[PDB]
Enzyme design. Structure first.
Site: not given
Ligand SMILES: Cc1cc2nc3c(=O)[nH]c(=O)nc-3n(C[C@H](O)[C@H](O)[C@H](O)COP(=O)(O)OP(=O)(O)OC[C@H]3O[C@@H](n4cnc5c(N)ncnc54)[C@H](O)[C@@H]3O)c2cc1C
Ligand SMILES: Cc1cc2nc3c(=O)[nH]c(=O)nc-3n(C[C@H](O)[C@H](O)[C@H](O)COP(=O)(O)OP(=O)(O)OC[C@H]3O[C@@H](n4cnc5c(N)ncnc54)[C@H](O)[C@@H]3O)c2cc1C
Ligand SMILES: c1cc2c(ccn2C[C@@H]2CCCN2)cc1-c1ncc(C2(N3CCCC3)CCCCC2)s1
Ligand SMILES: c1cc2c(ccn2C[C@@H]2CCCN2)cc1-c1ncc(C2(N3CCCC3)CCCCC2)s1
Ligand SMILES: c1cc2c(ccn2C[C@@H]2CCCN2)cc1-c1ncc(C2(N3CCCC3)CCCCC2)s1
Ligand SMILES: c1cc2c(ccn2C[C@@H]2CCCN2)cc1-c1ncc(C2(N3CCCC3)CCCCC2)s1
Lengths: 487, 485
Positions: A459
């Protein structure tokens, strides 16, 4: 001058066969071709049709044409410049393409100079007898003999040639061969035919045409790109039109005459007329059998006109073989390559091998491009009781921002719904030729739809849409299209 | 009274929430700290990927690639007034902001229109094994908004930029703030060797104003640790070729403000550098602090991830964790897959677990990377005989384009005992798109012979993967040699 293998035609298949026979199995090989580098008068040359007047220069030229879209699309991402200063220099494109093709010609000539038991002969090969290839100064049997090559095995690998319809004024038209060397880009051009060559050149000319210009593509029937997925045929037609190309279906030229200024006055069977500067016929390619004197030794053609071969590329004459476009099957460079390698493994390597002509991946470098592997759904629905079609279609986000909202990506997967086996994958959109290559590996492993949707996506890409389709969009049951399965 | 409360409306959390409500009719609450992208908390409804990750960075890399396209067009006969050319960062960020907001709003509509799927704005934390408290801020003493009663709790709060403890760290940004810089920096230092530093060095390199310079520093010898080593060296060269300065074996020791507001960086070696922006991209750490995990005793791994088993279960019975907070593969499609499997297991009666091996991923560097499976020095430690197939070449167009430095690299790593492909590593335009179906191949346990007996699509960069029949070299008991004994 007694060779293990004499190859007539130093092209995609012939060169792979000659190189393998010489370097893998130590055999003495002669290869005949009519020029050492691209261009008039004979167009193809050492390296073949792909290198000289095919895949390689057309890909360079499509690449050049894509900058029309890039330069416009850059504005949505904040790029600013004087749009009225933008101009495309066709002579520069042709000159650069000529340098790049010539570098390959020079490379292959070094391969011959340095490789033991691999010898090149300049001239026109034909069959004098079952073990003698004669090389003459011209394609005419009355021209002088240059050498007689004694051959234990003979490989016919002379390719195909543009078909030109016998209409009055055909002599004022060109084929793809001459299109590669036009001195100026035509302001108005008619490309004739609905196949990949017509479509690919339509997009090239569309980018390089001078101001006030128009590209028209005509095709005798209702929908271009017969043999490709029907959704894609329709979407390409729309995206060509969106980029300014006029697509003229159910039309076919009946004659061409010259206007006072040297332009061409085309009259169609329908009575319509069109003035263009260039008429490019791309209605088909026929096997290049005319100069080989096959009747001297009795090599048989098929009812269609290609050299008849079995699955090991054997003709009806012992020790004479044929590969590539002259067999009039799949007219693709990597297929000719595979056939040539398989032939040499079998004949000289005590390793019998045959080319699999199913599930071959291929591309069309339209703008945007097509990538495809395997059966379209119409064909699957005749060979299988239950067929499922998974389909996803959308304008990518990047292209809503670019301003090219007509650029809808299409991904379609065709399965045998009985066991889920993937029968075909068809793609339209940026990167499709690159996406589909490893899909051919998947089909060669008999992947099922669940092997795709249980693979984790990369992605953000277009390709991950292939791993995001779990539920058929519709079905064919005993040939009948329907949205839901019976009951 | 909720079947499932999800803390974090991101990649993994939204997939779990949606699936639990729409596939299994369950009652779901989802908490996040913002309904749309940007400062002060950057991530929001949709997660890191939607708001300050994959989606906007891909848009910005795409924009950056136009610098190369405009220059390369000349070799194909295109001309235009080069002195009129400007890269308008403000327009780029404005278009990106609107694309992200559109997705923010779409998900807001999802919640408003889906029964059993409810959103709560605020900061979620664990009050007890069955209660998620939502507060006005991350401060545990801030006012309570809601207290959600939960049969099952899903920890899905993602990760956060790591920042070193150096004097002046406050003058440094992370990737979060880079997405919102009001002007493109003329001079930028990206700190770190990982994919975010590399990707953003390419973005800034394209939009920088005249007289500008991008510098990337890395504390060790070679950037992109964990990627194929041939690719690490070659991407270093190709970044250098496009004007980026790569400063290895250097690490910032302190940062202060110059009188114009620019930053004065002092390195541990004593070197100094003035830049307009210092972007720290040295790592991302699981986002655990605000969750009050010590209340209920959720155990952490030594490196700070929430410890889970193969089904994403913590040590506390109805408390799970998916996504970056588990500090494994920090990828959006992995978090999505973990979320969906967790719900299938808990609410669906079909135990599913995420396979974390053979996952394809990409780096949208310029030029880009596509990879799936093991690199060769890891394979060499797990397998007695390893074969490495390697091909490097110049795509046809870059004999014309003026960018001769743009070599494409294809590498295949196999178990040489049975030919099984253990890893595929690609560098060059198209690589992210090529590698997706390679991931399918590895799930089918493709052997190298399955690649080279597949017929090529010509001309493409990807057909190179079907054109390698003979190892370039081997590892035998972990020892590199060109020929087998
Ligand atoms: C610059 C960058 C580029 C990236 N590029 C890629 C890419 O090209 N391809 C790829 O596969 N991955 C990419 N990633 C990684 C990807 O963004 C993450 O792996 C993915 O978003 C993880 O999903 P998640 O469900 O773990 O959490 P996230 O999608 O990070 O969601 C966590 C959410 O929890 C919320 N939150 C946090 N603490 C609290 C709390 N205490 N109470 C309520 N809400 C809270 C935050 O606001 C956030 O919206 C990238 C990451 C970064 C930083
Ligand atoms: C415009 C165009 C675009 C194409 N694009 C693609 C593409 O993108 N992908 C793809 O896979 N395929 C493409 N093809 C098809 C591909 O070029 C052919 O399928 C391939 O070249 C066939 O190889 P071959 O070995 O059969 O013969 P060829 O490669 O055609 O080689 C035959 C050689 O025989 C020589 N010759 C002919 N008669 C004699 C004689 N009597 N004596 C000696 N030498 C002789 C010719 O000079 C020529 O060099 C394209 C074709 C065209 C025309
Ligand atoms: C070129 C040039 C070559 C040689 C040998 C010597 N010189 C000249 C030397 C090279 C360095 C200095 N001067 C070989 C070549 C080849 N190019 C392509 C070749 C292959 N096919 C075989 C037929 C055409 C296609 C077979 C091998 C895999 C790739 C495809 S063999
Ligand atoms: C060059 C170029 C080659 C390839 C394969 C692909 N391209 C690329 C060119 C670019 C346009 C067309 N294809 C191979 C070569 C080779 N150069 C030398 C080679 C030989 N020896 C092998 C060891 C060193 C010496 C082999 C034995 C005979 C000649 C010497 S093989
Ligand atoms: C000739 C020879 C050419 C090339 C490019 C390279 N070489 C020579 C190569 C390289 C070394 C040896 N082989 C191109 C050409 C041509 N381009 C256009 C040509 C004309 N007509 C229009 C096109 C069809 C015929 C118009 C211009 C006047 C002559 C007729 S002839
Ligand atoms: C959006 C907006 C939606 C709805 C439902 C109503 N409205 C608002 C309405 C729709 C018409 C006009 N406005 C759903 C959505 C969704 N978007 C994405 C969703 C998927 N994944 C699950 C969630 C995380 C991502 C679901 C599975 C397919 C892949 C994507 S579900």
């Amino acid at each position: 001058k007694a060779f293990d293998l004499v190859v007539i035609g130093a092209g995609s298949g012939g060169l792979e066969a000659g190189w393998n026979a010489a370097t893998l199995y130590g055999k003495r090989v002669a290869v005949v071709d009519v020029q050492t580098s691209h261009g008039p008068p004979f167009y193809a040359a050492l390296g073949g049709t792909c290198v000289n007047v095919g895949c390689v220069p057309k890909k360079l030229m499509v690449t050049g044409a894509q900058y029309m879209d890039h330069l416009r699309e850059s504005a949505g991402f904040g790029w600013e410049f004087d749009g009225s200063s933008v101009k495309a220099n066709w002579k520069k494109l042709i000159a650069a393409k000529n340098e790049a093709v010539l570098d390959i010609n020079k490379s292959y000539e070094g391969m011959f100079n340095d490789t033991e038991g691999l010898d090149f002969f300049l001239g026109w090969g034909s069959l004098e007898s079952k073990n003698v290839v004669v090389v003459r100064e011209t394609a005419d049997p009355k021209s002088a003999v240059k050498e007689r090559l004694q051959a234990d095995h003979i490989l016919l690998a002379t390719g195909s040639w543009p078909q030109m319809p016998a209409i009055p004024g055909i002599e004022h038209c060109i084929s793809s061969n001459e299109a590669f060397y036009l001195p100026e880009p035509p302001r108005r051009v008619l490309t004739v035919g609905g196949g990949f060559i017509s479509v690919e050149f339509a997009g090239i000319f569309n980018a390089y045409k001078p101001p006030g210009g128009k590209v028209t593509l005509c095709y005798r029937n209702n929908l271009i790109l017969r043999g490709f997925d029907e959704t894609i045929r329709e979407e390409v037609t729309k995206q060509l039109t969106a980029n300014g190309i006029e697509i003229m279906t159910n039309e076919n030229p009946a004659k061409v005459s010259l206007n006072t200024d040297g332009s061409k006055h085309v009259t169609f069977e329908s009575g319509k007329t069109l003035d263009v500067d260039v008429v490019m016929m791309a209605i088909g390619r026929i096997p290049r059998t005319n100069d080989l004197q096959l009747g001297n030794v009795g090599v048989k053609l098929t009812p269609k006109g290609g050299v008849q071969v079995d699955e090991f590329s054997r003709t009806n004459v012992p020790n004479i073989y044929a590969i590539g476009d002259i067999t009039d099957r799949l007219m693709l460079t990597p297929v000719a390559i595979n056939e040539g390698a398989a032939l040499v493994d079998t004949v000289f390597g005590n390793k019998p091998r045959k080319t699999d002509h199913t599930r071959v991946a291929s591309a069309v470098f339209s703008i945007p491009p097509i990538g495809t592997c395997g059966l379209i759904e119409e064909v699957a629905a005749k060979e299988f009781e239950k067929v499922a079609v998974y389909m996803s279609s959308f304008t990518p986000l990047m292209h809503n921002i670019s301003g090219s909202k007509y650029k809808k990506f299409v991904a379609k997967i065709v399965t045998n719904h009985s066991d889920g086996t993937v029968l075909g994958v068809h793609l339209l959109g940026d990167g499709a030729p690159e996406i589909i290559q490893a899909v051919g590996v998947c089909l060669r492993l008999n992947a099922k739809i669940s092997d795709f949707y249980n693979t984790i996506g990369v992605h953000p890409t277009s390709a991950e849409e292939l791993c995001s389709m779990r539920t058929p969009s519709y079905y064919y049951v005993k040939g009948e299209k329907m949205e839901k399965l019976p009951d």
